Known about the structure:
Bound molecules: chloride ion
Radius of gyration: 19 Å
Number of domains: 2
Amino acid sequence: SKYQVLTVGNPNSGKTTLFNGLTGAKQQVGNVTVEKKTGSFVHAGDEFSLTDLPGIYALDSSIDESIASRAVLTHPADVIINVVDATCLERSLYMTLQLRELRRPMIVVLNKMDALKRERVHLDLKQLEAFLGCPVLALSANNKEQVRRFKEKLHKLLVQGIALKQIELHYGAEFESLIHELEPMFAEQAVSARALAIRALENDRLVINGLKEAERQNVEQRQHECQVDIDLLVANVRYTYLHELCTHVRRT
Ligand SMILES: [Cl-]
Protein backbone atom coordinates (compact mmCIF):
# COMPACT_ATOMS: atom_id res chain seq x y z
CA SER A 1 0.00 0.00 0.00
CA LYS A 2 0.92 3.67 -0.39
CA TYR A 3 -0.37 6.24 2.08
CA GLN A 4 -0.42 10.01 1.64
CA VAL A 5 -0.20 12.24 4.68
CA LEU A 6 -0.48 15.99 5.38
CA THR A 7 1.13 17.64 8.41
CA VAL A 8 -0.69 20.74 9.55
CA GLY A 9 -0.57 23.11 12.52
CA ASN A 10 0.37 26.53 13.84
CA PRO A 11 3.91 27.92 13.38
CA ASN A 12 6.13 26.48 16.15
CA SER A 13 3.59 23.76 17.05
CA GLY A 14 6.23 21.18 16.09
CA LYS A 15 4.61 19.95 12.85
CA THR A 16 7.92 20.70 11.09
CA THR A 17 9.73 18.81 13.84
CA LEU A 18 7.47 15.78 13.38
CA PHE A 19 7.68 15.98 9.60
CA ASN A 20 11.47 15.93 9.96
CA GLY A 21 11.42 13.13 12.51
CA LEU A 22 9.31 10.88 10.31
CA THR A 23 11.13 11.52 7.02
CA GLY A 24 14.88 12.14 7.54
CA ALA A 25 16.33 13.82 4.40
CA LYS A 26 13.89 14.15 1.43
CA GLN A 27 12.63 16.50 -1.34
CA GLN A 28 11.50 20.11 -1.91
CA VAL A 29 9.81 21.98 -4.81
CA GLY A 30 6.95 24.57 -5.06
CA ASN A 31 3.15 24.85 -4.54
CA VAL A 32 4.04 29.80 -7.28
CA THR A 33 7.27 30.80 -5.50
CA VAL A 34 6.16 29.20 -2.22
CA GLU A 35 8.14 26.04 -1.52
CA LYS A 36 6.45 22.64 -1.21
CA LYS A 37 8.19 20.26 1.19
CA THR A 38 7.69 16.53 0.68
CA GLY A 39 9.28 13.42 2.15
CA SER A 40 8.65 9.70 2.60
CA PHE A 41 9.36 6.73 4.77
CA VAL A 42 8.66 2.99 4.56
CA HIS A 43 7.15 0.92 7.40
CA ALA A 44 5.82 -2.70 7.36
CA GLY A 45 6.04 -2.94 3.56
CA ASP A 46 3.87 0.18 3.09
CA GLU A 47 5.19 3.48 1.75
CA PHE A 48 4.28 6.85 3.29
CA SER A 49 4.17 10.01 1.27
CA LEU A 50 4.09 13.19 3.40
CA THR A 51 3.49 16.82 2.51
CA ASP A 52 4.04 19.62 5.08
CA LEU A 53 1.53 22.50 4.93
CA PRO A 54 2.95 25.95 5.87
CA GLY A 55 2.12 26.86 9.46
CA ILE A 56 -1.24 28.66 9.89
CA TYR A 57 -3.43 29.80 12.79
CA ALA A 58 -6.71 29.41 10.87
CA LEU A 59 -8.04 28.10 7.54
CA ASP A 60 -8.72 31.49 5.95
CA SER A 61 -8.32 32.52 2.33
CA SER A 62 -1.76 35.75 3.39
CA ILE A 63 -0.37 33.48 0.69
CA ASP A 64 0.89 30.72 2.99
CA GLU A 65 -2.55 30.65 4.66
CA SER A 66 -4.12 30.47 1.18
CA ILE A 67 -1.99 27.49 0.15
CA ALA A 68 -2.74 25.57 3.38
CA SER A 69 -6.45 26.28 3.22
CA ARG A 70 -6.52 25.11 -0.40
CA ALA A 71 -4.54 22.01 0.49
CA VAL A 72 -6.79 20.69 3.27
CA LEU A 73 -9.78 20.92 0.89
CA THR A 74 -8.28 19.49 -2.30
CA HIS A 75 -4.96 17.71 -1.73
CA PRO A 76 -5.22 13.89 -1.60
CA ALA A 77 -4.64 12.55 1.90
CA ASP A 78 -5.45 9.29 3.60
CA VAL A 79 -4.88 11.19 6.82
CA ILE A 80 -4.31 14.71 8.11
CA ILE A 81 -1.98 14.97 11.11
CA ASN A 82 -2.82 18.11 13.09
CA VAL A 83 0.08 18.87 15.42
CA VAL A 84 -1.14 20.92 18.39
CA ASP A 85 0.84 22.84 21.06
CA ALA A 86 -0.63 21.72 24.40
CA THR A 87 0.64 24.74 26.33
CA CYS A 88 -1.90 27.03 24.60
CA LEU A 89 -4.85 24.86 23.71
CA GLU A 90 -7.48 27.63 23.53
CA ARG A 91 -5.66 29.12 20.52
CA SER A 92 -4.17 25.95 18.94
CA LEU A 93 -7.43 24.02 18.70
CA TYR A 94 -9.18 26.76 16.75
CA MET A 95 -7.86 25.33 13.50
CA THR A 96 -8.52 21.81 14.77
CA LEU A 97 -12.23 22.72 14.87
CA GLN A 98 -12.11 23.92 11.26
CA LEU A 99 -10.29 20.74 10.29
CA ARG A 100 -12.96 18.65 12.07
CA GLU A 101 -15.77 20.41 10.19
CA LEU A 102 -14.23 19.15 6.91
CA ARG A 103 -14.84 15.54 8.07
CA ARG A 104 -11.65 14.37 6.39
CA PRO A 105 -9.70 11.54 8.14
CA MET A 106 -7.41 13.16 10.67
CA ILE A 107 -5.48 12.74 13.89
CA VAL A 108 -4.64 15.31 16.54
CA VAL A 109 -1.12 15.03 17.87
CA LEU A 110 -0.62 16.83 21.16
CA ASN A 111 2.91 18.22 21.43
CA LYS A 112 4.82 19.93 24.28
CA MET A 113 3.08 18.01 27.02
CA ASP A 114 6.12 17.66 29.27
CA ALA A 115 6.17 21.46 29.34
CA LEU A 116 2.58 21.19 30.62
CA LYS A 117 3.49 18.73 33.39
CA ARG A 118 5.76 21.49 34.75
CA GLU A 119 2.71 23.65 35.51
CA ARG A 120 1.07 20.61 37.18
CA VAL A 121 -1.66 20.74 34.55
CA HIS A 122 -2.89 17.41 33.21
CA LEU A 123 -5.18 16.77 30.24
CA ASP A 124 -7.79 13.99 29.89
CA LEU A 125 -7.11 12.82 26.32
CA LYS A 126 -9.92 10.30 26.58
CA GLN A 127 -12.41 13.18 27.05
CA LEU A 128 -10.69 15.44 24.53
CA GLU A 129 -11.07 12.54 22.08
CA ALA A 130 -14.75 12.39 23.04
CA PHE A 131 -15.05 16.13 22.29
CA LEU A 132 -13.09 16.23 19.02
CA GLY A 133 -14.39 12.86 17.68
CA CYS A 134 -11.00 11.93 16.15
CA PRO A 135 -7.86 10.18 17.51
CA VAL A 136 -5.82 12.30 19.87
CA LEU A 137 -2.29 11.14 20.71
CA ALA A 138 0.34 12.49 23.07
CA LEU A 139 3.76 12.70 21.45
CA SER A 140 6.81 14.90 21.95
CA ALA A 141 7.71 15.69 18.35
CA ASN A 142 11.40 16.07 19.29
CA ASN A 143 12.31 12.67 20.69
CA LYS A 144 12.90 10.12 18.01
CA GLU A 145 11.85 7.10 20.07
CA GLN A 146 8.31 8.42 20.49
CA VAL A 147 8.16 9.49 16.83
CA ARG A 148 9.23 5.97 15.82
CA ARG A 149 6.53 4.36 17.97
CA PHE A 150 4.22 6.87 16.36
CA LYS A 151 5.01 5.35 12.94
CA GLU A 152 3.59 1.98 13.99
CA LYS A 153 0.51 3.59 15.54
CA LEU A 154 -0.15 5.67 12.40
CA HIS A 155 0.29 2.54 10.25
CA LYS A 156 -2.17 0.69 12.50
CA LEU A 157 -4.76 3.47 12.28
CA LEU A 158 -4.46 3.78 8.51
CA VAL A 159 -4.82 -0.01 8.13
CA GLN A 160 -8.03 -0.38 10.16
CA GLY A 161 -9.43 2.97 9.05
CA ILE A 162 -9.77 6.00 11.34
CA ALA A 163 -13.05 6.02 13.27
CA LEU A 164 -14.64 9.46 13.48
CA LYS A 165 -17.78 10.82 15.10
CA GLN A 166 -19.07 14.15 13.87
CA ILE A 167 -18.14 17.11 16.05
CA GLU A 168 -21.17 18.56 17.89
CA LEU A 169 -20.45 22.27 17.27
CA HIS A 170 -23.63 24.30 16.71
CA TYR A 171 -23.74 27.95 15.63
CA GLY A 172 -27.20 28.90 16.95
CA ALA A 173 -30.54 28.74 15.16
CA GLU A 174 -30.18 31.68 12.77
CA PHE A 175 -26.77 30.57 11.51
CA GLU A 176 -27.75 26.91 11.29
CA SER A 177 -30.74 27.86 9.14
CA LEU A 178 -28.42 29.77 6.82
CA ILE A 179 -26.09 26.76 6.69
CA HIS A 180 -29.06 24.57 5.89
CA GLU A 181 -30.34 26.68 2.97
CA LEU A 182 -26.88 26.45 1.38
CA GLU A 183 -25.75 22.83 1.92
CA PRO A 184 -27.49 21.47 -1.27
CA MET A 185 -25.35 23.88 -3.31
CA PHE A 186 -22.29 22.11 -1.84
CA ALA A 187 -23.62 18.53 -1.77
CA GLU A 188 -21.54 15.74 -3.38
CA GLN A 189 -18.18 17.41 -3.20
CA ALA A 190 -14.95 15.86 -1.89
CA VAL A 191 -15.61 17.46 1.52
CA SER A 192 -18.51 17.95 3.94
CA ALA A 193 -21.13 20.26 2.45
CA ARG A 194 -21.70 21.79 5.91
CA ALA A 195 -18.08 22.99 6.00
CA LEU A 196 -18.32 24.31 2.50
CA ALA A 197 -21.49 26.21 3.47
CA ILE A 198 -19.81 27.63 6.57
CA ARG A 199 -16.81 28.66 4.39
CA ALA A 200 -19.14 30.32 1.93
CA LEU A 201 -21.06 32.16 4.70
CA GLU A 202 -17.65 33.44 5.88
CA ASN A 203 -17.15 34.79 2.32
CA ASP A 204 -14.27 32.33 1.69
CA ARG A 205 -12.65 33.23 -1.63
CA LEU A 206 -11.65 29.64 -2.34
CA VAL A 207 -15.15 28.19 -2.17
CA ILE A 208 -17.08 31.18 -3.47
CA ASN A 209 -15.19 31.53 -6.75
CA GLY A 210 -16.11 27.97 -7.82
CA LEU A 211 -19.76 29.08 -8.04
CA LYS A 212 -21.82 30.37 -10.96
CA GLU A 213 -23.32 33.87 -10.80
CA ALA A 214 -26.80 32.83 -9.58
CA GLU A 215 -25.56 30.74 -6.66
CA ARG A 216 -22.96 33.38 -5.72
CA GLN A 217 -25.79 35.87 -5.36
CA ASN A 218 -27.59 33.33 -3.19
CA VAL A 219 -24.65 33.05 -0.78
CA GLU A 220 -24.10 36.83 -0.65
CA GLN A 221 -27.84 37.25 -0.01
CA ARG A 222 -27.62 34.80 2.92
CA GLN A 223 -24.67 36.81 4.29
CA HIS A 224 -26.77 40.01 4.02
CA GLU A 225 -29.63 38.14 5.78
CA CYS A 226 -27.63 37.28 8.91
CA GLN A 227 -28.29 39.80 11.71
CA VAL A 228 -25.01 39.22 13.51
CA ASP A 229 -21.58 39.79 11.95
CA ILE A 230 -20.60 36.31 10.79
CA ASP A 231 -16.84 36.31 11.43
CA LEU A 232 -17.58 37.26 15.04
CA LEU A 233 -20.40 34.78 15.60
CA VAL A 234 -18.22 31.93 14.28
CA ALA A 235 -15.50 32.96 16.79
CA ASN A 236 -17.79 33.22 19.79
CA VAL A 237 -19.25 29.82 18.99
CA ARG A 238 -15.80 28.33 18.53
CA TYR A 239 -14.02 29.92 21.50
CA THR A 240 -17.03 29.21 23.70
CA TYR A 241 -16.65 25.56 22.67
CA LEU A 242 -12.93 25.48 23.48
CA HIS A 243 -13.66 27.08 26.90
CA GLU A 244 -16.24 24.31 27.52
CA LEU A 245 -13.76 21.72 26.26
CA CYS A 246 -10.80 23.17 28.11
CA THR A 247 -12.74 23.35 31.36
CA HIS A 248 -13.74 19.69 31.09
CA VAL A 249 -10.36 18.29 29.99
CA ARG A 250 -7.95 20.35 32.18
CA ARG A 251 -7.16 19.79 35.85
CA THR A 252 -4.44 21.64 37.79
CL1 LIG B 1 -16.47 13.46 11.08
